[PDB]
Amino acid sequence: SMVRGRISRLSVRDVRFPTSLGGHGADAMHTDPDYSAAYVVIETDAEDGIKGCGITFTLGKGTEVVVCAVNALAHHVLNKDLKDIVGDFRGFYRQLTSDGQLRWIGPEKGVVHLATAAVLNAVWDLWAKQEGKPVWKLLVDMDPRMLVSCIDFRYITDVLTEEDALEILQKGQIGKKEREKQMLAQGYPAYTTSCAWLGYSDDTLKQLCAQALKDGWTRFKVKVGADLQDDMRRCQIIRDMIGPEKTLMMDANQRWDVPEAVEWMSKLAKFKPLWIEEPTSPDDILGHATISKALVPLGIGIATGEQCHNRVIFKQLLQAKALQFLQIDSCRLGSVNENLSVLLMAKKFEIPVCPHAGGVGLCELVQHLIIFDYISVSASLENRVCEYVDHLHEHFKYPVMIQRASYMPPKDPGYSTEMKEESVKKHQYPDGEVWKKLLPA
Template sequence: MSHKIVNLRVRDVRFPTSLEQHGSDAMHTDPDYSAAYVVLDTDSGLKGFGLTFTLGKGTEIVLCAVKALAGLVIGKSLQEIVSNFRGFYRLLTSDGQMRWLGPEKGVIHLATAAVLNAVWDLWARAEGKPLWKLLVDMDPKQIVSCIDFRYITDVLTEEEALDILVKAQEGKKQREDQMLKEGYPAYTTSCAWLGYSDQQLKQLCSDALKSGWTRFKVKVGADLEDDIRRCRLIRQMIGPSSTLMIDANQRWDVAEAISWVSRLAEVKPLWIEEPTSPDDILGHAAISKALAPLGIGVATGEQCHNRVMFKQFLQASALQFVQIDSCRLGSVNENLAVLLMAYKFQVPVCPHAGGVGLCELVQHLILFDYICVSADLRNRMCEYVDHLHEHFTSPVVIQDAHYMPPKDPGYSCEMLEESVNRHEYPEGDIWKQEIKK
């Protein structure tokens, strides 16, 4: 069956998370976790669901961009798209008029992610497999045929990519079995948002330890003395053998990042995340160099806007942990390129998640990465935030601080119709009540 796409619908879904400071950090003090939520209808009745994550205001701009892309999608069959997926990726990202709005960055690329995530979901459903399994079972040649190598051939050619994938076929079955049994290691960011009180922080930390968590991330960057106090508190709670990461969400300039993080070295963070502008490759390289003697790595990626930027972060040794995001890059297609480049440079991938739906999506990518690319779990873990999973039809399953491989067909993007209706902005019940206040 060809599954011809006959309609594309997009909705503005917002959760009022700012009310309780969930998700608050040094640069985003009041996020309302939101999504531009895409549904593809096909002539067979099969649907594809996709989304891109946003922080509230401005989600309507992404919707507008999705609508501008819709004309390139409607009328095509799934068959037609996946038989030349690289071409389809380029069709969306290189339209002669629309590429001026990016190219491959910002609103237009977030919209591209939402649309392509829905296409991948549709494909996985058509094959009756969870997305990670669709990828794992795919022939290496077909995998590389999904990737647009434009602008990255100086670091990774199609031939090299194929070679990496072919070599990693060895032991694939065992790793798949291992994942099905043990799951993929996770860390939690739920304990220490910047807006939380010390008491809240302690309570959450204590609960998390009881649930088996051993890796914790803390938001920093607003006030140094406060950071020292909070980080000491957490390190005391979790003990010396647990892993601690800190995240500044782009708060500093280069010199400030180095001096601030040096002061926090005493709590032995594994990494400092987003110390400065997400565009500043050379700045991250300088910070990496300065912090290496302290044993602190640099992590970034959730706002790294495309494969060309990731390429340079790797070339410049500007990061020690690659944080791919399922909704910022051009979906699976572009993330495949980043996973392969990270492998080439032997830099571990530790995906960004949280928000709304990011955990649901990115778990598929990191499972594929372990089973078919890296074959390595050292220094690798996937972010987990315990928010908003109840709105999805196939929510993540966490067992003993591990992501258990999803079993339902698709990319785990589908939200409950009831949740979408209630949270649609500005007409849903939740927002009508909010507006009334």
């Protein structure tokens, strides 16, 4: 190991992009988001210029609450040797997520968990950079006992023990060189959400579809759930542009009650969607299973997970057979540590993982987790695909590289969390240039 240094400084800033003024990103539930992030930077006393950068994604308002919670957690990482953190990553994870007082404001959900993901993302970035490897490669090269030492198994040993996790990782060693070669040569298959958004005229939507088809996209998501006639109008346009052999996914962003989701989907089934994403509340495990049993006979699978708050919810979704596609999120769960536990549970249950992405930097982070999944955990692309959105990559130092609608594996050390300091400063809320122009004093 090349790990060194004591964590000496932490900064956290409220960064907001005015995407609600751009006209893209509206869904049936979040009709006016301003893609934002709590951006964390940690420094060591190593004098090597290597910094750990971390993010968590928000929709604008509430980013200041996340920043507050990052400040509440900061004393746990400050003045700690990085060797001591990475040497007992499970222990450090438990101190952040089960703090005897702070856990009351979660536990492991909402603001406090988003803040925990931002801090832990900065530590994974720092560790991967000191090791001179992208996070996906750090994970791929990790000894299975070392990897399981980073994971907290509390509340999931009833479906996945440490021993079960080791067995999946040992099996994942077989053909790992061939799978890493495959990833470097062709990338991780993606779908586009760039034609999905609510509010587009017919002409606008036809233009976005034509451009995506021309650019090589063959898998498409569409937002639904506010207005059935509008959903039929937009699904008709997309399905006519893309043809019957191309993949169409629908996303209701939690709009419906359980019987309502079945009824609405019975009317949209003519568009032959591969899946219906978030048909109801992200907490309703039994609800997702009820909708899944009703719709799998129509040939429609259920997808959920982007707002699923922790591994206990994912465990029950797998236990209840509530979903056909499990959608991890790099910044909703407890960073790499908790995402690893969910990848391992999904393989244990033989359920495909289709990551959520988009927002501010979710593509940049989550691509590492799913490349690692392919090489070392599931060893398959069957029924698996990574979301992609064409937003805000110009603000990242290491933006995602898409080739033939595929994620090319990041080459640089780190978790691709690092933002351009000029971008951070212009978009800092409330005093950055952009917000002084949009909300003048």
